[PDB]
UniProtKB/Swiss-Prot annotation, chain A:
Disulfide bonds join 57-286, 395-427, 411-428, 595-649. Keywords: Calcium, Cell membrane, Disulfide bond, Glycoprotein, Ion channel, Ion transport, Ligand-gated ion channel, Magnesium, Membrane, Metal-binding, Postsynaptic cell membrane, Receptor, Signal, Synapse, Transmembrane, Transmembrane helix, Transport, Zinc. The gene is grin1. This is Glutamate receptor ionotropic, NMDA 1. InterPro entries: ANF_lig-bd_rcpt (IPR001828), Glu/Gly-bd (IPR019594), Iono_Glu_rcpt_met (IPR001508), Ionotropic_Glu_rcpt (IPR015683), Iontro_rcpt_C (IPR001320), NMDA1-like_ligand-bd (IPR049872), NMDA1-like_N (IPR049873), Peripla_BP_I (IPR028082). Its main location: membrane. SMART domains: Lig_chan-Glu_bd, PBPe. The keyword Cytoplasm does not apply. Belongs to the glutamate-gated ion channel (TC 1.A.10.1) family. NR1/GRIN1 subfamily. It catalyses: Ca(2+)(in) = Ca(2+)(out); Na(+)(in) = Na(+)(out); K(+)(in) = K(+)(out). Glycans are attached at residues 39, 181, 254, 278, 328, 346, 415, 444, 622. One of its GO terms (biological process) is ionotropic glutamate receptor signaling pathway.
Curated annotation (Swiss-Prot), chain B:
Zn(2+) binds at residues 97, 254. L-glutamate binds at residues 468, 473, 518-519, 560. Glycans are attached at residues 311, 516. Belongs to the glutamate-gated ion channel (TC 1.A.10.1) family. NR2B/GRIN2B subfamily. Component of N-methyl-D-aspartate (NMDA) receptors (NMDARs) that function as heterotetrameric, ligand-gated cation channels with high calcium permeability and voltage-dependent block by Mg(2+). Channel activation requires binding of the neurotransmitter L-glutamate to the GluN2 subunit, glycine binding to the GluN1 subunit, plus membrane depolarization to eliminate channel inhibition by Mg(2+). NMDARs mediate simultaneously the potasium efflux and the influx of calcium and sodium. It is found in: Cell membrane; Postsynaptic cell membrane. The lineage of its organism: Eukaryota, Metazoa, Chordata, Craniata, Vertebrata. This is Glutamate receptor ionotropic, NMDA 2B. Detected in oocytes. A hydrophobic region that gives rise to the prediction of a transmembrane span does not cross the membrane, but is part of a discontinuously helical region that dips into the membrane and is probably part of the pore and of the selectivity filter. Disulfide bonds join 56-291, 395-410, 402-411, 574-629. Residues 1-494, 495-633 are extracellular. Heterotetramer. Forms heterotetrameric channels composed of two GluN1/zeta subunits (GRIN1), and two identical GluN2/epsilon subunits (GRIN2A, GRIN2B, GRIN2C or GRIN2D) or GluN3 subunits (GRIN3A or GRIN3B) (in vitro). In vivo, the subunit composition may depend on the expression levels of the different subunits.
Amino acid sequence: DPKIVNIGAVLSTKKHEQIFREAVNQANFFHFTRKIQLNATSVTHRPNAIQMALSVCEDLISSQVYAILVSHPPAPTDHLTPTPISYTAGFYRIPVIGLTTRMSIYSDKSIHLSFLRTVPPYSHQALVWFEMMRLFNWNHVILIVSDDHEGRAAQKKLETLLEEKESKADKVLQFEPGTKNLTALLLEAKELEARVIILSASEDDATAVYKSAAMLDMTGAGYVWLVGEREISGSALRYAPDGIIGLQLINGKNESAHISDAVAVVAQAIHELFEMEQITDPPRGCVGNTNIWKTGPLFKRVLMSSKYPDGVTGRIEFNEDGDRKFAQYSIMNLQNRKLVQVGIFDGSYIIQNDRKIIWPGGETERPQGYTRLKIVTIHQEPFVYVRPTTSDGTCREEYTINGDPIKKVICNGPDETIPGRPTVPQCCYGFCVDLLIKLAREMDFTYEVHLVADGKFGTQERAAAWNGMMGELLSGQADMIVAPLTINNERAQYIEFSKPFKYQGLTILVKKEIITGINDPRLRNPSDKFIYATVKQSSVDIYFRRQVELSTMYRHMEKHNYESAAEAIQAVRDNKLHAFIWDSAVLEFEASQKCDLVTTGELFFRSGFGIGMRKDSPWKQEVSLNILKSHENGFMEELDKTWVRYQECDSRS
Amino acid sequence: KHPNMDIAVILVGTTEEVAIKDVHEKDDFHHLPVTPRVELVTMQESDPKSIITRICDLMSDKKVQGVVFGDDTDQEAIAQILDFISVQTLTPILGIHGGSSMIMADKEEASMFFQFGPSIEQQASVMLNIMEEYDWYIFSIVTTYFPGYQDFENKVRSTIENSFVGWELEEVIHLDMSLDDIDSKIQNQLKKLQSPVILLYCTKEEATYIFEVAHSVGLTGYGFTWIVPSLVAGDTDTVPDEFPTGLISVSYDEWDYDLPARVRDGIAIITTAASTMLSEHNSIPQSKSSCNNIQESRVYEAHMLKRYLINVTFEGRDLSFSEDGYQMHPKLVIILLNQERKWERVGKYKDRSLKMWPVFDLYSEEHKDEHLSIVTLEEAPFVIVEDVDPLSGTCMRNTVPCRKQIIKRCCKGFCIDILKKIAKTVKFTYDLYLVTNGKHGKKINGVWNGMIGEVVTKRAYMAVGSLTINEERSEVVDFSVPFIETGISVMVSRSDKKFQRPNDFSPAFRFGTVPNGSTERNIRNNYLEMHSYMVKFNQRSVQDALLSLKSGKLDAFIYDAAVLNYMAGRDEGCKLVTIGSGKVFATTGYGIAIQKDSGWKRQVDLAILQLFGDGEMEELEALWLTGICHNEK
């Protein structure tokens, strides 16, 4: 006996409905009609979501559809107008197949679990870009995305592609939709060294993107643009820059080819399905059924695995999300302000059409790609000094003890002078600054420095991250850290460390004028009467907390802590506190500076000071390489000789 | 002038045809500026078509400005459906019970939908409080692709990172219910996890399948326990016994407040939001309800309503919502599956804080396992071996038995007492014996010797004694924190390089130490000449080394600082003293061996400084360590 197995669909026009029924009949004719038969039902798009959902429950599901096909309407209303069906069929787990919805938001199985499509989403376009990036060998790019499930998905996909490689987030830039002026964000973009750009946005947004981009002349040569199908199309095409690279999916406009093929796949899936037993028909009508349809997920499983590589649309296989795989796109170029096919992309490999490559601005062939360092510091007296620039005028001609003029640079940092704390423009001059500029003459880089808002260098706290300049480094507020930073393993895992410019260890300052060891019985014999003082969140405190062996001794130090270096030296000078503990490099210079106060014992926690960088940044490789080169010639020795005065002091006893 | 709002409410289920009609809506709190106009309707079983049709049907020209939904059903999906209508209408809708109260995907921001179920994040927090209460530290999560995953995984991650405790997340599993399995792929994964406490997250229906599969896997039994969010328990009226017993989950209580009281809460929220919005703009909230046509004008203006509606208070009770649309902190009850089919309450939880009833053993030592044999050696101020009274036949008082393979010897002393207190505090039992080969560990060529050998051979778990600490032994075995200040030191009657060479001084000088010591090894490592010279002055034993010092024929003696200080205090005559202040180089302390990174470890360390924390060590120092000499002080 025959059994009539219904299928259902929502399509743009009655002609396409006839096309649907025709394809279905082709499926019936060409597969056993004795065992099973396929029947076709369809409806035009309705003006609202609701009429259509009601149509599915009433007009379609009453026919017991085993699956539904859906296409984008003639006039797109908002976006993802085939949103309701995926939900509606989804309740009963009836598989849905979209023809025209390239929308990415359907890729998450969680929200739409019945959704499959004969087209890949806009996110999957990144497959091309990685391959494109692969060929041209630009590892450094910039990504501009709108803020929504679409853009963020694109970012996730591309980044996931990059994850197999060393993860590459050269930079990423998020803007929110509907925003006419984007200028500031691109101003941020130019600073990034990488000269290749890729973007995903809506047509209207893209107009604003190109409009803003042209103002800053980022459309020029030495810059590259890679984009989505939507970006090249519409009003965006009108305002689009020359030489841009662009994508168009094949048969994206046509529902019908996708119809014939989708139905073909459905037929193959069903005929493969009925080979299995314990099947159940879908629920008859929406009314009276609160229960899902147990077969539906299985139908989805076979249908996702359903092969039939030969199709009108191209190869057919489905990814985990139910999204299509191995789809083909045609690359497009803007030559003479018109769209041309430079090449076509099919399968996992790009194909180059005979047409000449165009890049933006004039290039016969120009694959060109790939400038600033944000530096952060802290207020530490020996290696850094802070004075404000006098009025508008910049820096003093003040001279070192050896006759040389003192060099200086501008730094934006926390000011306690005002009652509120503004990030204040300031002048800073230092050993680390001279070193930095020494590098800057040696290194291709240019430098802009601002002091970190927090007086602390950094410490883990609060989830969140370690407060202080280090935190800025991971955050990227500053890409490189130049300061007197001790180098330790706890920090070391998080970031790369430059070879030490300086070698120093902790020690104690006490006034001379009338502490046996790092282990002082006097420390070991603490007293409320005899204070020993430090800074909370100073790395020394990390030594106290991390180390188990002295863990008891930490607490006595914890009492009566000071906030900053100046206050800590002052307490001993003021004689408020009998002893002060800090690393030598900051301390010895002061020991020379007063001589009223003295350093004692042997540097313990022997360590070094180095310049912080992310492990991912290769510039540090040169930095250490440079640091060593600066050590061998005695550059450091002369710099310490300049900045450590040594003028008046001696061993007192 | 008279501002009468238009409102509608629906009840589904109720286990009655002729479900209780219009029980409420009786004027309460009439003072509120807008008076409610109510139309009530009920429908028996839920459908997307039935619900959509009916709600739009009630919309008609009626122009209702608000809707409350309630159900007898366990269904997850319903909330989303009504939410969809809300997205379309921009007409507020909320629900007080069952599925609508059950969690849903993150709501569209433009959309207005609210649920009287708890937040996913909140629920995860409560699950964590429950685990913390029973101090179940180690756990895993089984989840499904249903919405809220990774809002849940993230929430657990956030809640977990902050806490001090060393809890372990073992595994997180994501399995698609779609692409339903021949593979029993869920069985294949679930079989892997070894963790005692499992959090599960899924649809009500899915929990059944996962549980049947767990029953096949053997995961429901014997020591493993499962903890569940609101969704699985749902109504709690109907419970397939596919769910294992002892299953722990949170839900809203029917008993505290009945469903009509809850509906009253909903109506109150809608009319309070209307009153506040009125107070702000003096404007009628009323809007055309009909879905079929385009949304009524100035309904687009409605956004502020949501902004007003998020937190609402009446009857001294807060309805405050969260951005997602769940109420910020509804009262919640900790529930368990009592034996048979019972859902019987265990805990109450509200706002910040949680309270639970049962004390212990809710629903071969559970806290910890195995046994530890210990090896030691006899020292003259760390451990003392004594011969037990033969008539007694067994050890007396503080003395604890220790055996030496060659006979039962009786050990007592500092190590015995410290060990005894530690054993009392951590509450474990132990076997003590004496080392044979090489005493404290000694290296000849390639191989180790001594107690360390028995620690490496696993013939000993922990080694105790006067054993000093060094980098090599810390490398091979984890050491306890030092209990006492000690180290290398000198003892004589009464860095200069006088030690470095004897030959510089014309008369021959003399100093020696006990061989196979950490002192001798350290010496050989840093100072060769001293070792090569001192080998002649090496002595058999501390009593004999003392014989070389005491009777003459040797000038200076060098040894452990604690022993030399105790010996300084204890001497037949005060003929012997320490060097300088006895301030020792190589500042060290006595540690205790463990195997490697795997050990009771930190638990020991805590115990140790608790010993000083109560000040016992000072007493023990006065009793055992304190010598009579150093009397003129």
